[PDB]
Design a protein around this nucleic acid. Structure first.
Lengths: 136, 163, 83, 131, 201, 89
RNA sequence: CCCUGACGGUAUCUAACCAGAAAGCCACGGCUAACUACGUGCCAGCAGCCGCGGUAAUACGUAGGUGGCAAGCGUUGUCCGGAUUUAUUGGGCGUAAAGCGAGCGCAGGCGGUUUCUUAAGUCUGAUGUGAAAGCCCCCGGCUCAACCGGGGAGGGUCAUUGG
RNA sequence: CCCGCGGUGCAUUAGCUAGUUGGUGAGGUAACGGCUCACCAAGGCCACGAUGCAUAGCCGACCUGAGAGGGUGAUCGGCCA
């Protein structure tokens, strides 16, 4: 533009948005829900369990859950590793991370942090998957 | 003019490319090579050639690369002034630097700059990053470098009158 | 009285009130991001012992003390009259 | 309509330089004559002759070429523009092309080169870069 | 931490001796592990700058934080270059002073001698090996208990005494005469690859 | 109630003090009017630096020292000069 | 002259004895430094982006080896950079996204040559002020360093007065 | 206590004010003043963004960037509530 056009109407940039938006929450206790309080994790209770089939061209039955969070908004979350122990109404912890298997899943549960349990064969990257060091 | 290829020259591969041509039935494949050539004293050329295997390709390219060479003036391991070289969607800015600072330059341009004996210079690519056009733009920008003596000769002045 | 107040210059704009006139003082100032100079205006109220000066006059005013809810200036002199 | 006669002068010089012929004529003005003298003193122009009949003009410039017909001015640029003016302070005077080129500055004591201004320690409006 | 491993795998991985030319690369000059004798293709220009940096870091046995702070400090001189001033500040640390003087064979031994409290600068004891020895400071050998087995023997066999080091083998005092120069200091590895390695850190 | 008092500036167990003239309502390490010298409780014969041409000017305007400031202002011979200017004229 | 320590028998210094009590986390297909075995067979699983897995997988899971850092090492969240991807510095509109279907015109933005004058912008000098602590420069003290202290510069689109 | 200048989003928020704007006098306060009264008049502010709605204590400073900038106002100091 001419610099007179710029002075009449300035430049405006684009606005960025998270991909873990249910992790900036607020309570639903006294009045309403507040957005200032960016968290690294949130916890919740799993209202179902089970399996689902991935996109094209993968092929599997990937384990997942649906979870209600402390701020009372609902999301589905992937449960990783080989073999878990999660049943209805067990309390879990979520972190960010999006799976590329199917739409609608944007979170991971963290193993070995609440009712969820670490996987019981691992020997190589136990800091993920929440396995303690074995004397073997 | 021709800097004639009769020196001690250390070449360098900058890129290779699997390139096809579909014919009746299936597919043909060649290899294209991009090579630089210089002596780390102020003479640098680029050249490319293609063949059916990688050694034959790089050979034909060094053949081509030696046919062209540029003079690349400098004033004590640092370019005389600041230039911007543009060639078809590749824009490259080059600045004089401080003594012992190094070369801060990207992949293609640093090969060109190091094989001419440049030691301290800053660069930036405000353009596309296709290796051939980056190399061509860089050489296009060195050709604009002016010696301090030539300017004083063209005008009716002496040096130490314009510096 | 070795300390000094502020005097200004402007062209009278309203003269409807009794003993009070609005004076616009005009100046140019730059843009913070871009360079060029824009013009800027602010209006002042000044006191008139007898409702003398009229529109288009080029006046000077001086700072006093609160004389009302809005007026803080008095009329020094008329420099150049409109016709 | 014409709004920048200094820019028109500069573009005449650059246009007639790139096509490499040896004369040029412009309508005269007190500022263009000043920068024609500054261009003559440093070694970009060969000569300048002043005709004047019944309107402002004119000014005739004689360009200059190397020994193998190469060009002594390589480009030329207008810095302060009507629409965004550029003022410079005594410690902000620019050095175009590491001293191998000149800048032209108007001060309270003339229209002078950028060396003569950082030797006097003043600043002003910046007209042009010629390198 | 410092390091305690086999110390000789380290030289076979950099391709440089690191131990006073006493040959760790005598037999098998290749790298450790299964794929040692069977080398493979080219190395990037990231591998080259990394390998130079690791060569210098393992020469004088320091950690990565301290290496980087020393490098950032050498950059505030602006009298000379930036790799020369670095490799020269590296030499003025009390461990190299004990190595060069000749009271110890290795640098690990010199480090343990200055750590366990057996040396003194200007009479006062100093215990920490990253100390910065300035020019003209006679460092001594704790004239309390200078009758130890290994110090005695390693003063006899002088494999290398430089042109900037002064010393007398009776009172056991040494000092730097003046600052060294690159010609006098490993003109073999680099100081430019290392400077480039820290440009994009 | 202008005062002349000490102000702590050490780390945890190595204290240092600035000699400062402050309104008495202010916090010990808060706002002050100006600084007048320095004092070091370590350094076995303790170190005092001070201007002593502003101390004599504040003293004659009604400022008042604390107990330690008076001790280290008499070891410097500033109270004698106040004595010889006021009750002598 | 004389008189007072919560920390506290704290820091510290001297003597004897013993290599004895004190190393883990991530990665190794390309980006990006570091590879071979066995198990399994589009399953179980992995992924930041490309993408792996259907009988000889350096991409899954173990073992051996190797690389990076180290009393820490990885993961998630938030912000600036890379991003000239809102471009004053520093981009564009024939066909890639982008010239209103065209005119007439109030306010605004910008304007030919020249003599004298003014000093609003512009340039420049002197004085006041822009706290202390911070970043930075020189010097000094804790065995070194973090840290602590002394003397300076810097930072205004600032005010007043003279060219 | 009064004044110049400076730091936020929305025009899918354009009209807002009736002690409101000015004068005469009286009361009142440390103090000037619509600060509050009685009378007289019809003024004041707005595209150079009034009004309304949403969000926010402000600064020395701190992180990042070649710079111009952008993002924060926790420990420590100043002002406010």
């Amino acid at each position: 533009p001419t610099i007179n056009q710029l002075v009449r109407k300035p430049r405006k940039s684009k606005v960025e948005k998270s991909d873990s938006p249910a992790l900036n929450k607020g309570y639903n206790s006294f009045k309403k829900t507040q957005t200032n309080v960016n968290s690294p994790q949130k916890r919740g209770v799993c209202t179902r369990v089970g399996t689902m089939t991935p996109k094209k061209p993968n092929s599997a039955l990937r384990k997942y859950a649906r979870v209600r969070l402390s701020n009372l908004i609902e999301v589905t979350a992937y449960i990783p590793g080989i073999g878990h122990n999660l049943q209805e109404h067990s309390v879990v912890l979520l972190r960010g991370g999006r799976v590329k298997d199917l739409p609608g899943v944007r979170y991971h549960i963290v193993r070995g942090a609440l009712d969820t349990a670490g996987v019981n064969d691992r020997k190589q990257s136990r800091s993920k998957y929440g396995t303690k060091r074995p004397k073997a | 003019y021709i800097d004639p290829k009769h020196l001690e020259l250390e070449d360098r591969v900058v890129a290779i490319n699997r390139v096809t041509k579909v014919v009746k039935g299936g597919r043909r494949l060649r290899f294209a090579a991009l090579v630089v050539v210089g002596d780390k004293n102020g003479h640098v050329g680029f050249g490319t050639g293609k063949a059916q295997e990688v050694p034959e390709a790089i050979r034909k390219a060094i053949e081509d690369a030696k046919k062209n060479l540029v003079e690349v003036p400098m004033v004590g391991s640092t370019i005389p002034h600041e230039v911007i070289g543009v060639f078809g969607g590749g824009r490259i800015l080059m600045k004089p630097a401080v003594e012992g600072s190094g070369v801060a330059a990207g992949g293609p341009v640093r090969a060109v700059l190091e094989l001419a004996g440049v030691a301290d210079i800053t660069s930036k690519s405000l353009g596309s990053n296709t290796p051939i056009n980056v190399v061509r733009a860089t050489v296009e920008g060195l050709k604009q470098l002016k010696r301090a003596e030539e300017v004083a000769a063209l005008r009716g002045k002496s040096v130490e009158e314009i510096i | 009285e070795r300390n000094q107040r502020k005097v200004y210059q402007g062209r009278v704009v309203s003269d409807k009130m009794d003993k009070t006139i609005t004076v616009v003082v005009e100046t140019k100032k730059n843009h913070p991001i871009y360079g060029k100079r824009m013009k800027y205006s602010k209006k002042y109220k000044a006191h008139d012992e007898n409702n003398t000066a009229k529109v288009g006059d080029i006046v000077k005013i001086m700072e006093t003390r609160p004389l009302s809810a809005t007026k803080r200036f008095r009329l020094l002199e008329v420099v150049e009259e409109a016709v | 309509v014409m709004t920048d006669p200094i820019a028109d002068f500069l573009t005449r010089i650059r246009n007639a330089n790139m096509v490499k012929h040896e004369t040029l004529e412009v309508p005269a003005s007190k500022i263009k004559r000043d920068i024609a003298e500054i261009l003559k003193r440093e070694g970009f122009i060969r000569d300048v002759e002043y005709i004047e009949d019944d309107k402002q003009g004119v000014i005739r410039v004689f360009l200059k070429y190397g020994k193998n017909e190469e060009r002594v001015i390589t480009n030329l640029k207008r810095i302060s523009k009507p629409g965004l003016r550029a003022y410079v302070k005594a410690d902000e005077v620019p050095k175009v092309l590491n001293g191998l080129g000149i800048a032209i500055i108007s001060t309270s004591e003339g229209v002078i080169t950028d060396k003569e201004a950082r030797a006097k320690n003043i600043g002003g409006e910046v007209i042009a870069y010629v390198w | 931490s410092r390091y305690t491993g086999p110390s000789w795998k380290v030289s076979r991985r950099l391709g440089i001796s690191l131990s006073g030319t006493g040959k760790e690369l005598a037999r098998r000059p290749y790298k450790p592990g299964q794929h040692g004798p069977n080398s493979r293709g080219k190395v990037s220009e990231y591998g080259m700058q990394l390998t130079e940096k690791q060569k210098l870091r393992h020469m004088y046995g320091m950690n990565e934080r301290q290496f980087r702070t020393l490098f950032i400090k050498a950059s505030k001189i602006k009298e000379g270059k930036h790799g020369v001033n670095f490799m020269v500040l590296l030499e003025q640390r009390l461990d190299n002073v004990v190595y060069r003087l000749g009271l110890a064979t290795t640098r690990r031994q010199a480090r343990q001698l200055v750590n366990h409290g057996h040396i003194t600068v200007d009479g006062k004891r100093v215990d920490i090996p990253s100390y910065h020895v300035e020019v003209g400071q006679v460092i001594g050998v704790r004239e309390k208990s200078q009758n130890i087995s290994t110090i005695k023997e390693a003063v006899e066999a002088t494999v290398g005494r430089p042109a900037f080091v002064s010393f007398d083998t009776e009172k056991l005092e040494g000092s730097f005469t003046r600052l060294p120069e690159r010609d006098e200091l490993y003109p073999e590895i680099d100081e430019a690859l290392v400077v480039e390695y820290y440009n994009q850190k | 109630a202008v005062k002349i008092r000490l102000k702590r500036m050490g780390s945890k167990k190595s204290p240092f003090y600035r000699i400062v003239v402050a309104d008495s309502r202010s916090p010990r390490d808060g706002r002050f009017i100006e600084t007048v010298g320095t004092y070091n409780p370590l350094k076995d014969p303790a170190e005092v630096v001070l201007k002593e041409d502003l101390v004599l000017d504040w003293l004659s305007k009604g400022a008042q020292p604390s107990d330690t400031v008076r001790n280290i202002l008499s070891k410097e011979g500033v109270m004698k000069k106040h004595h010889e200017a006021k009750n002598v004229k």
